[model samples]
Target: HEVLLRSTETGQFLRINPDGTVDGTRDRSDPGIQFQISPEGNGEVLLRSTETGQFLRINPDGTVDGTRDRSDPGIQFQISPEGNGEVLLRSTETGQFLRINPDGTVDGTRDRSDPGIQFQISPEG
Candidate 1:
């Protein structure tokens, strides 16, 4: 099933672009913001973009991008359940949490001390 990843801090939805990049959008009904959660047979899952057919991945330098490579470990994420219907997307590559910067760009940081990494996963209506 398709779902929308809503940022608890930014009040935005995770959006996939046609250029194979990812961003956040405030539009709840945006079609490009939908993602498919595919389990990796482990505790983690792959977040594939419904718009570009790419997997949401973290670059080597910590930037968030989309890739078509399914074997990329950087695309794998552990969905940790938090209280109050929230979750944390932790990267398998760097063990960092996926976070949205103050500039609105997505990146990963090892600092679990920040609450910005928490997100609310809701079914797209």
Candidate 2:
């Protein structure tokens, strides 16, 4: 059987298949959710979660590649400098803001849940 799944920490608003696998997550993390799937089975996800008051984007790989915190938890997201779908994250922790690279490398991100950020990779010269 073929299955697609997506969800958040709360595990609310679940979309599951007959096999009991998830097709999408629609919990507190995804309120005004929208999806755009490519003909090739690839997809783009857009949603606004009331809990965090932020907008989120999920890439085809089932990775939440982008987020923008409008009210609480700040804003956070990622971009691909090479335009290949690869991305990173810019976020905060312990009162210091940080930048995360596509390879999972993280920089100092302070404690503030009000301003989110994004990561963009640069091609090597």
Candidate 3:
């Protein structure tokens, strides 16, 4: 199933670029904003890019990127609900929460309560 992640603070859609970089887009029709979210048991999930067929991955360098290998350990993200349909994604590999800054740059952090870590998940499936 496909979904769109919109930042509650910035009010922008999470979008992945053709170069594999992530950003926030104001266009609701952008295909880069769509992702195939696959559940992986418990509260974990795999976010596969619909535009590139790559899975969202977190790196040790505090960057969030995409990998074509679905088996990559960094592809797994533990989804934690934060009420009001918002959720926090924590990388199982790096033990860091996925965060998108006000400018839309994607990164990972240890703080679960970070404002950038919150997202409103919208189903497009």
Candidate 4:
């Protein structure tokens, strides 16, 4: 199914740019707001930008980006439930959690318990 992953910390939506870049936007109606949430078994999932057809990936340096290569293992993530219907996405490659900054930029960090990693997974239109 498709979904809009919103940063509960910033109340912004996760968006992927046409150039495969990603950011957060306050506009829920943004074209990049939609993502395909595909389950990959073992409780892991893949998030693909429905607009750009790229999968969300975590770089080796702990940065986040959109990649067209589905074979990239960084495209996989493990979701864990948190407070108030929020969820945390962790990179299976680095074992770090995904965090969204105030500027809507994303990165991977070791601090898995931070609220910055929590997001609201809502259904997309």
Candidate 5:
């Protein structure tokens, strides 16, 4: 099923750009903002862009991007329940949390000590 990953801090929906990069969009109705959360088993998942068919991944520079290659370690994520109907998207490769920066750019950080990394998964109708 398709879903919208809404940042708990920024109140924006995660969006996949035409350039294969990820950011935030305020419009939840946008087609490019939806994602297909496919389970990779063992509590892990592969977040594929409904718009680009690319898997969401963390770049070497720590920025969030999309990759066509499913073998990329950065594309795999572990979703941990954070209580209160929220969840944490932690990168399996780096042990970092998928965070939405204050500027709206997406990135991965080892410091999940902050609640900004938490997200609320809203299923699309």
Candidate 6:
């Protein structure tokens, strides 16, 4: 199926599935865009926020699954079959990379901003 993705300029990823499902979104925070998905079904949706100085992740179920923010901690994202999902998050007063696992748990690291901030999974490049 095909999906339509959107951005909030602040740092949110949104997808509108062919099935008419909209997923993957969060409040605005910084200045970072999402990355390309992986070739495998298991992919990563990365996010970066300039204000927060962190990156986030979104799952395929339209649910937020993880994050990598330090200044402000955020949650993970999930995309649904129709290509829609939601994310959970929190920002830190200080600075750090926030992360969320499949279990909906949250964590954070310090000073780590690689290129692979946001990514998605597709059949083609």
Q: Write the per-residue lDDT of candidate 3 for residues 8-109, one digit (tens) a residue.
A: 889888788898888788899888999988989987889988998889898989888899987799999887888879888889989998888988688899
| Candidate achieving higher lDDT, 2 or 6 | 6
Candidate 4: residue pairs that collide: none
lDDT of 5: 0.85
The segments of candidate 6 whose C-alpha lies over 4 angstroms from its true place after superposition are 1-4, 7-31, 36-53, 57-73, 83-125
Worst 10 residues of 4 by lDDT: 107-116
Instruction: Give per-model TM-scores.
Output: 0.93, 0.21, 0.93, 0.93, 0.93, 0.21
**TM-score, cand. 1 vs. native:** 0.93
Off-target runs (Cα >4 Å) in candidate 4 are: none
Flag the better candidate by TM-score, 3 or 6.
3
Q: What does candidate 1's lDDT look like per residue over 1-125, in tens digits?
A: 78988788878788888876678888776778889999987788999988889999887788899888888889899999888899999888878788876456777888887767889988765
A best-first ranking of the candidates according to their lDDT comes to 3, 4, 5, 1, 6, 2
How many residue-pair clashes does candidate 4 contain? 0
Runs of candidate 5 with Cα error greater than 4 angstroms are: none
lDDT of 4 by residue, 1-125 (tens): 68988888889888898877788899867889898888899988899898999999988898789988878999999988876798888899888888888887888888866667889999855
- Per-prediction count of colliding residue pairs? 0, 24, 0, 0, 0, 54
Error of 3 at 88 (Å): 0.4
**Candidate 2 positional error at 63, Å:** 14
- In candidate 3, list every pair of residues with a backbone clash: none
